[PDB]
Amino acid sequence: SPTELTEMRNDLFNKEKARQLSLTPRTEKIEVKHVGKTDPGTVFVMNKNISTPYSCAMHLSEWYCRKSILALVDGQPWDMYKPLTKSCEIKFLTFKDCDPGEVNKAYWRSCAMMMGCVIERAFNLVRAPEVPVISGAFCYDVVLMPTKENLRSFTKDAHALIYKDLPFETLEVEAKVALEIFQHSKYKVDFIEEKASQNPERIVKLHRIGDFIDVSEGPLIPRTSICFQYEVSAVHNIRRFQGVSLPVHLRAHFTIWDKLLERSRK
């Protein structure tokens, strides 16, 4: 049941987190270097399973915290809030880099997740499709007809969520655990299995927004507040709901925004 399920999943997640915490023996210290175009060649003396790249950012300044989104540690994107295992090399990524593609994908994923969350409450979710940026939307596939009013309502919900301003909790988990968490949803289970198959370690990437929890391939954006302009364009027949959304740091402006929305609608 929907009243039970959410709570149960949350509890499971908490348990998993606790388990993860358990392994480290009382504050293990690692020396994580900063590779970057500015503020070099600093090293941060961090506590390994606790401390994130957010901590590193904080140490550097507040500006970094504000503008960083993905943390390339050994040339692979960590989330700002996902802990730094072992001594490694960090870069922080904004929207306005020379190579912002990684960030964009993450943002899209986040948006999709948000959409899914909105869907789940508003009234089964198969997957979030891996859509590019030039494709002009972030979609989400849902097995259940909506009017303009419905769309508006959805948008409002999303806005509310954004306002609430929740951190994107992260875990890389066993496949069995993942299965246990989502055994009710068949499609989700299948997806999880596929993911497991894909990698050598089972290493299923669970992400969480307070109450809502979901599986996704890539990393995610720190918080929901980074989304500024967020809308839900249309639904197409499984039923694929679509959306288009621009963050703080790239505001569209009215006419442009409208155009974007129109584009998404197709």
Partner: protein
């Protein structure tokens, strides 16, 4: 001449229990006998007041005023102190709790006026004071809504009595 601000950094609060709120790090720092007028310092101080160190620093960098540089320097020193001596881990987590300007000792000179006459120039100095606290800058006053006002009015109405009689 008194200096209590300086002293203020030498307090030792008795240690906490496990089940207790964190008790954030307060940090006090000054600059004495700055060559400036106190009231001028005050505007800068005001501008800084509620803000995160970083934001304040940024503001100071681009405020074209003599005292702004000084204040920035002071803030930087304060930050340094926090990191080294006062066991604050993140620079970014420092916000400015207090900032005020006192008058320093002032030197009297002659001004030499037209006719036989003369004013007394007073060459002014300031003490700049800062308090940084650990933790993000507290949220400012949310401007009270119509609803709030209405509620207040209702309360007021309720509150009345028959004044004098019994």
């Amino acid at each position: 001449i008194s200096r209590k601000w300086e002293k203020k950094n030498k307090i030792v609060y008795p240690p906490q229990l496990p089940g207790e709120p964190r008790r954030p790090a307060e940090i006090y720092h000054c600059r004495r006998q700055i060559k400036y007028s106190k009231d001028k310092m005050w505007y800068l101080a005001k501008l800084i007041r509620g803000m995160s160190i970083d934001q304040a620093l940024a503001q100071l960098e681009f405020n074209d005023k003599k005292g702004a540089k000084i204040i920035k320097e002071v803030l930087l020193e304060a930050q340094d102190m926090a990191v080294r001596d006062h066991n604050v881990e993140f620079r970014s987590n420092l916000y400015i709790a207090e900032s005020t300007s006192g008058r320093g000792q002032c030197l009297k000179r002659i001004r030499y006026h037209g006719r036989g006459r003369f004013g007394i120039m007073e060459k002014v100095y300031c003490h700049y004071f800062v308090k940084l606290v650990e933790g993000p800058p507290p949220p400012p006053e949310p401007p009270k809504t119509a609803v709030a006002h209405a509620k207040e009015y209702i309360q007021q109405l309720r509150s009345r009595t028959i004044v004098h009689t019994l």
